[PDB]
Design a protein around this ligand. Sequence first.
Ligand SMILES: O=C1[C@H](c2ccc(Cl)cc2)CCCN1c1cncc2ccccc12
Ligand SMILES: O=C1[C@H](c2ccc(Cl)cc2)CCCN1c1cncc2ccccc12
Lengths: 304, 304
Amino acid sequence: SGFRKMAFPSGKVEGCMVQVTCGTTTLNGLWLDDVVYCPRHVICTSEDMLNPNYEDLLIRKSNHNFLVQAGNVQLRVIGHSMQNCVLKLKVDTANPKTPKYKFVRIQPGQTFSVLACYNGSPSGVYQCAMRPNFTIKGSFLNGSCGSVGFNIDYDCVSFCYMHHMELPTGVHAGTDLEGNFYGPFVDRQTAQAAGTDTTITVNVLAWLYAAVINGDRWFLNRFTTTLNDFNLVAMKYNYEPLTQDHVDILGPLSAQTGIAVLDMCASLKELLQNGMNGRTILGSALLEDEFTPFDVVRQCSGVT
Amino acid sequence: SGFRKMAFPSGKVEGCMVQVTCGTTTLNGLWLDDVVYCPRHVICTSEDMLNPNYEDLLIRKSNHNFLVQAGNVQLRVIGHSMQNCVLKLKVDTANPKTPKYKFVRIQPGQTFSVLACYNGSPSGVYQCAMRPNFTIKGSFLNGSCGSVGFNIDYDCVSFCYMHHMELPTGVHAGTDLEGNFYGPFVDRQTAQAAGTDTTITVNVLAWLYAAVINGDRWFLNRFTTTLNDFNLVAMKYNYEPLTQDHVDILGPLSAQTGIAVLDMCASLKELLQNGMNGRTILGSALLEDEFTPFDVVRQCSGVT
Ligand SMILES: O=C1[C@H](c2ccc(Cl)cc2)CCCN1c1cncc2ccccc12
Ligand SMILES: O=C1[C@H](c2ccc(Cl)cc2)CCCN1c1cncc2ccccc12
């Protein structure tokens, strides 16, 4: 028993972390096979950050201007290209530590582990979710650019995120491993609106099941609801509208606890309308939405 | 900016995780050099768990009865011994992935990362603290025994914890890497009292500094206090008595923010006496005590 904000073991990803220096700028890169992926803003300076013409800036850069360093060794850049907001530097050596990998673009509400890096060296690992407004509430400092978000399926690493920037609101924006930004964000130092951040209702419900599984049952009530009645309440409280897919995905948790999804929705409805009254659930005084039903199942079953 | 419950990168520890099977029992072991460390209760069955005479049980076991498996390969046990509540199985091969390491016994209030394992395979990593009552509020299922807690100092892994059991209260108890239990716990399936769990005051203050550093300043007030006045309030609210050592350890955080430690103590005093009033600090509705001042400095400076 016990429920924690667990992250995937980072070893497979640590073996992919390299330093990428272009001119006076240094950030993290991901070395998989003979390619190093990093944010394209490595070619920028702090002057041309207001309005960068990346095609123009990149034209003034050659293979030898990209200094890729893995631990202590220097990699030889034999090719370079821009793919959306990422640079792909082809190196003469394939990473001997390259795990089995996939580049996948995750959906909002989905969770992933982040390995925060500085100068190509890992420093921390934490779990987080792709917020419904496509931002991540991470922990990143100047130098963390190129740090990746990933998931692990036995031995296969699914890279889903690459960190690029911190918005003036303190939250973080970045791309999938093909250079496509999650959200409406552009890699420009300009005023960007993150948008309304709503609560991942299917995740709050999954975490409510995790609480029942681990003993915290106080919030459980004698009531029930319907998808439309529950949704009227979710809209007022800025909660993601719950669909029949969400109900189905909660099926295995509903089976483990014997609590119907709509009964759990009524318990949640009462927690939104009445608050916690000073009580906690899984050691938290607020409703947690950064655990997917897959995370709750995996953590409460012990998948390695 | 941004503040998260970060764990150390687990790669160095993943390379030490092995499976240890003794009879019908299977748990995790830590392979460093030619020794595998694991909880001694691997030699027990579910019958002799009420009152095990480990010296007697161990006498009936030989080197060949311990099946140590690293990934896919089977290690050859050429020696075995009991050191307090741990078994040290000497194997014929030194772990080629053994990092630079130390076995240190941490103090309550100190934090460490846990790599949760099942059948010698890592499944998750999370950060946690040694509670003042010597228990850990972890996330462990049947099979996680032998999972370790550690800290990393550049390239040196300080092993501080080995998981042994879950108490009937749902919290976890385990040993340092010399087999010595943290707390009054014995490796017996009997009613054990965890004790009163208090709040790590120096950690709540460090996290309050982290909040000011990251922008959340609402809790900051126009008042000040003294160590003795603050402590009267800490005692009523079951908070660890704050000493002059704690004040000194908060020195660098107090310097970064320009907020005197006793001024922050007055802000904390008001948060205890008046509650949060529905507000949050660093995205949390309760006072967080699982970040030491070293963690706040490391996370807000970017140490790799
Ligand atoms: O957001 C940025 C900056 C930026 C600006 C424009 C464009 Cl196009 C991309 C990136 C500079 C590089 C670092 N960076 C940061 C990324 N994460 C955490 C940060 C914490 C404090 C300070 C800067 C941080
Ligand atoms: O506490 C124990 C048991 C035990 C009993 C007596 C003695 Cl001497 C040691 C250990 C059996 C082995 C597994 N174990 C567990 C450890 N962590 C999480 C557990 C979650 C659910 C069930 C058991 C868990």
